[PDB]
Amino acid sequence: MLKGVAASPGIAIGKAFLYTKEKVTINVEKIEESKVEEEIAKFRKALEVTQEEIEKIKEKALKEFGKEKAEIFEAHLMLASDPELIEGVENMIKTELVTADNAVNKVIEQNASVMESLNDEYLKERAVDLRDVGNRIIENLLGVKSVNLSDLEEEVVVIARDLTPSDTATMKKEMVLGFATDVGGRTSHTAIMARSLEIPAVVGLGNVTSQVKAGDLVIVDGLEGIVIVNPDEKTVEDYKSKKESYEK
């Protein structure tokens, strides 16, 4: 069996799906000066896509989680639409004759590192917001695709190597059995979230992405802090009766 951190107690039984994300290869190679306008055009197009992305995410967050999460994505949207960040990138492209990938990476990193260097925990949180937006812009420039687990209409377990709050806030409350991750980078967030969603979760398993695949039957045991993939017939019935014992 798998063992990790009991982010939230309870028993959940059903399907599990494995989040897959296209490899993010960022091209920061210096380009011909004639391609400056090309990269700027693509950047502005990526901003339009980024606005769509964030907006649609905000909707899901608002409806499922509430303004608590939606307002965060509103901040993300304002960052994406920030004339200062937009012009900064475009000027960076022309000035250094580099890609939009390079420009966004540098501009976003610079401004974020300033807020972090100020040693203000508030601005550090805002720096993370900025970092997230910048990364998603680059991904939209690259055309990075991934599995839309949030569009699933069935109670399933969320299996992934590394998720952020900004990603999990897309997941529909009633369509999530629980969470399980390879890493503990957001353990505390999955703990708070899962509990507020009234569901169990066991995170920081290590290699759940290799042990659990999409379509597999998985039992989430937040009481012991373990996860069972391909449960035995007896195991299913045992946790079945226990699930109802605690649920009902």
From TrEMBL:
Domain spans labelled Phosphotransferase system enzyme I N-terminal: 3-126
Protein family: Belongs to the PEP-utilizing enzyme family.
Domain spans labelled PEP-utilising enzyme mobile: 153-225
Protein name in UniProt: Phosphoenolpyruvate-protein phosphotransferase
Active site: H189 (tele-phosphohistidine intermediate)
Cell compartment(s), UniProt: Cytoplasm
Coiled-coil residue spans: 33-64
Role this protein plays: General (non sugar-specific) component of the phosphoenolpyruvate-dependent sugar phosphotransferase system (sugar PTS). This major carbohydrate active-transport system catalyzes the phosphorylation of incoming sugar substrates concomitantly with their translocation across the cell membrane. Enzyme I transfers the phosphoryl group from phosphoenolpyruvate (PEP) to the phosphoryl carrier protein (HPr).
Superkingdom of this protein's organism: Bacteria
